[PDB]
Design a binder for this molecule. Structure first.
Ligand code: FAD
Ligand code: FAD
Ligand code: YIA
Ligand code: YIA
Lengths: 486, 490
């Protein structure tokens, strides 16, 4: 059966590509995925990682965790109730999450059913040849063939997978995938990694932990959230500690063993040990390239393991493309969507378009959260002669009342001081992810720091702090930090 | 004999506008400044004080009281996410809220008092300022112009920044009603309250009273016209009406109190023009705010008022008297803190900085702290449709996923973008939902940079957020062509 486009992976990127090809350009599209709905055994499914074991369920679980702060903080505003009666039912959270995600799974299934030139196939897709995608029962290339899809065009969009370090007892550890389906909230949990997944789950586990519970986050280096603003990395560390999460920096598991009670004994490279109910490895995500049989057609990988692509998502093989996490670039849903749309406009429209990977807004659903767009000051300082940093920092008046006085709002703007051009905006505090979206738009209009400070504020908000910073706090000259210009 | 003091600038009103002007004049340009206000700290008898209406009896305390009110929703919405506690034990303690708000406001009052005691060429004078002549401001003990003179301040330049005051309708029993001013000091939360008005102050207080009412309590909002929140997007007006109703607030539209008497039990018996009646414990009038011009004795120097009652100003805040200026609510235009601040800063840069500058009153971001709130910047579609031959409206609306779990399914998110369809210029952005006031701030920057719809949709979304809806709208929902609403272009 003959298709213009075969997409392997019904995920953020694959679905955007497929939808657009069918509905905008009247093409015949086949999309393959390994499951129709979320969860064990394969976790991702129709909708992708984001829908099934990613942005969507984690956001709903962070919403859940936020109530731990809201219930306590309400007292300062005169709310009275029996604090001793308060309990966090993990099972109810997971059932509510499960229902929300399943509803999205069914809605996407109806999308395929109701849309011309857009067909779903269940199974494991791989490259037989330049123009043939084979769908099998399992990831085993020896398993029963279900379909052979002849394709003018093949889109690789299989996403990424949790990286598990090669330490003794790694089989006793879980990933984010299993975290979504834990029957019980872990009493003691170690989250391994300093990235957004580790931090976000440390917050989820911290709110739902049974009495006497303890969330520990470890990270092999000095400071969590490498690649984020340094002030914010230091402040989110403080804010996680203030909420009872134990941060172990410069620590890395060397091995994990089974205790007689079913708990885990973690030995660090330092020789420290910790007993936990759960060890969640969140050290990274690697391109999902192994099941695709890329060596059947010679699709080239980078040394890092990504499918190598040019700016238009083309592989070394004509009519084979790769978008989203499999290209091991920015591992974000909206980037995967943008690449898919760009690809389909390039190949099927008269409109060659390439995704802009600069000035992409992103968020960490820490409590409170991070919103960021564009360069951090140390990356700016290597690119530009004169960088100005503007910094506003304060305890929200509401947290003087709530008692959460540790909850510092941070707003930083990084400029090219030569012309005023905003290079980066970095926010920590309630609403930060919401504030930053339209900042993303501002950086596409070559917004200068004067464009922010000449805009009239919305009062009272956190966001108005962006329109109130007129004088640099400090500068980088030829890459060196200093309070005054040299 | 006590001598008058001489200043480059005398500001009447230590509020949002006046303090910005005063600070900038003294600290940026080395001018000698006097600022006059009637009270050093918030509350009765004059309510506004050092810091202005926003600090004392406006934005600051209302926002802290709305934050308090939001916990009614959080406590209930927590259960869907697995939170369990004794619902029967839940009590909203208004006295705690009011005491917390009072200490937050007093701390701002004290810090402003300190700025004044500490900053050279920036002096605070306690009392009632009025114009005696072109170059003399008199500070009196009261608003009565026969009250004792405390100071005469000679001024090269005079700034009128005395703000506004609640409007009270001339109805029988008006003395049985309060304004927002008294609302902030009620010793007890009212069991039954009528908020009169369809504006943001009525809507915002309705939400506050609704969360803190005792058992059996009821909040009623009345408005003389068909739909609350004139000036806001019509979809949002309709939806915030449904969301107030869904949270147990009674909305009486096309209804207006004709009189108020006291029942024998001391409760308020309200009779509407329709002959409908309602018994409440509190009637809060929030029908408008009027410029505070009466006490300035403007007739002494001939400062012209508009028909409407505001001080008349040109684009540079200049009155008809060359060295007398007016900014903020006294000009009776956009009654917003950050617009008063912008005007004050522009005035001082123009008068003392020799870099002339006028406030842009277009594309001003603003919010309503309804639950959930409104964030808006720029033109509503029916206004755009009168100025532009071809208007496109982009619209996203849905029940946030989190509210399918919370149970608050009535909490529909609305994002609307209004464009000149001719060139794609964004005229207006209108948001209803959690974070809308935070979202809209940088949208203000976008409109100042003449953003087009394609600037929005080429921007990559932050996922998952409400705000990414602004960046996923590629096709108009409908149009206006020569003022006519239609789903498709001809
Ligand atoms: C815990 C977690 C939280 C995240 N939070 C966020 C967030 O808040 N915001 C954000 O922007 N991003 C977030 N991400 C990242 C985001 O999920 C990914 O960047 C995005 O899903 C990648 O889209 P994609 O199209 O590359 O692939 P995916 O969405 O991963 O889709 C790949 C699909 O391919 C299927 N598949 C794999 N191999 C085969 C095969 N051989 N044949 C058929 N089908 C196959 C899989 O089942 C899967 O459905 C998160 C990720 C995780 C793990
Ligand atoms: C309930 C409420 C909620 C509000 N919420 C918001 C909001 O969320 N966001 C927002 O932007 N705006 C809000 N506002 C509006 C905001 O408060 C005003 O727009 C702003 O304060 C006006 O600034 P101003 O400089 O014109 O005057 P003000 O800030 O009102 O200052 C005027 C000052 O003059 C003093 N004064 C008056 N007469 C004399 C005299 N003769 N001599 C000496 N001193 C005198 C007064 O005591 C007062 O302190 C709210 C207003 C109210 C009432
Ligand atoms: C300015 N000032 C003064 C001093 C000096 C001067 C004067 C005049 C002019 C100029 C200068 C003021 C301001 N600032 C700050 O800090 N600031 C900042 C901050 C802090 C905290 C905060 C918060 O929370 N935010 C969020 C939002 C909101 C607000 C409020 C409320 F109630 C709720 C919510 O925020 C402020 C203050 C106060 C207010 F009311 C607001 C804001 C600074 C200082
Ligand atoms: C694009 N898409 C895809 C395709 C599909 C289809 C089509 C057609 C037919 C059928 C199917 C996606 C998007 N959309 C919508 O709507 N949307 C919109 C909405 C709804 C709801 C919401 C919310 O809540 N928001 C806020 C933020 C968030 C999110 C999520 C979560 F969990 C949290 C938070 O948001 C969506 C859905 C889902 C998701 F996950 C997200 C979002 C659309 C669609």
């Amino acid at each position: 059966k003959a298709f213009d486009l075969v997409v392997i992976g019904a995920g953020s990127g694959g679905l955007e590509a497929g939808w657009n090809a069918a509905t905008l350009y009247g093409k015949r599209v086949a999309v393959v995925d390994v499951q129709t709905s979320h969860g064990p055994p394969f976790y991702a499914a129709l909708g992708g990682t984001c829908v099934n074991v990613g942005c969507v369920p984690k956001k709903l679980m962070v919403t859940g965790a936020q109530y731990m702060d809201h219930l306590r903080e309400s007292a300062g505003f005169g709310w009275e109730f029996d604090g001793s009666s308060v309990k966090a039912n993990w099972k109810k959270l997971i059932a509510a999450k499960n229902e929300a995600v399943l509803d999205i799974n069914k809605s996407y299934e109806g999308m395929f059913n109701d849309t011309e030139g857009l067909d779903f196939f269940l199974g494991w897709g791989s490259l037989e040849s330049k123009n043939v995608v084979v769908v099998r029962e399992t990831a085993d290339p020896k398993s029963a063939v279900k379909e052979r899809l002849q394709a003018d065009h093949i889109l690789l969009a299989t996403g990424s997978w949790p990286q598990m370090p090669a330490i003794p007892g790694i089989e006793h550890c879980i990933s984010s995938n299993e975290a979504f389906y834990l029957p019980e909230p872990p009493r003691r949990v170690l989250t391994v990694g300093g990235g957004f997944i580790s931090v976000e789950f440390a917050g989820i586990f911290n709110a739902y932990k049974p009495p006497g519970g303890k969330v520990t986050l470890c990270y092999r280096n000095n400071l969590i959230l490498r690649g984020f603003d340094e002030t914010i990395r230091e402040e989110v560390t403080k804010q996680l500690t203030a909420n009872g999460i134990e941060i172990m920096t410069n620590e890395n598991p060397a091995k994990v063993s089974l205790n007689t009670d079913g708990s885990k004994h973690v030995t660090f490279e330092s020789g420290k040990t910790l007993d936990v109910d759960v060890v969640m490895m969140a050290i990274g995500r690697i391109p999902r390239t192994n099941d695709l049989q890329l060596g059947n057609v010679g699709v080239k990988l980078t040394p890092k393991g990504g499918v190598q692509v040019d700016e238009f998502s083309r592989t070394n093989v004509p009519n084979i493309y790769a978008i989203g996490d499999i290209t091991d670039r920015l591992m974000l849903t909206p980037v995967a969507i943008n690449e898919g749309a760009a690809l389909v406009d390039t190949v099927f429209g008269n409109k060659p378009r390439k995704t802009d990977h600069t000035r992409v807004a992103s968020a960490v659903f820490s409590i409170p959260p991070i919103g960021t767009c564009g360069l951090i000051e140390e990356v700016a300082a290597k690119e530009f002669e004169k960088v100005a940093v503007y910094m506003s920092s304060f305890t929200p008046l509401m947290h003087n009342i709530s008692g959460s006085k540790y909850k510092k709002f941070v707003a930083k703007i990084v400029t090219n001081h030569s012309d005023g051009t905003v290079l980066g905006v970095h926010l920590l505090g309630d609403g930060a992810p919401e504030i930053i979206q339209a900042v993303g738009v501002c950086l596409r209009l070559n917004a200068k720091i004067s464009d922010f400070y000449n805009t009239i504020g919305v009062h009272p908000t956190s966001a108005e702090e962006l329109c109130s910073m007129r004088t640099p706090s400090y500068y980088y000259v030829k890459g060196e930090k200093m309070e005054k210009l040299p």
